[PDB]
Amino acid sequence: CSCSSLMDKECVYFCHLDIIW
């Protein structure tokens, strides 16, 4: 995934995970 705003912080931080959630 991705986010149009880097300042929606928790949007960007769902995309930082990969299967090892």
In one-letter notation, the amino acid at residue 14 is F
Alpha-carbon radius of gyration of the chain: 8
φ/ψ region of 2 (left if φ > 0, alpha if ψ in -120 to 50, else beta) reads: beta
Method: X-ray
- Contact between 1 and 14 (Cβ < 8 Å): yes
Q: What is the DSSP letter of 7?
A: T
Resolution (A): 1.9
Encode 1-21: b = buried (16+ Cβ within 10 Å), e = exposed. eeeeeeeeeeeeeeeeeeeee
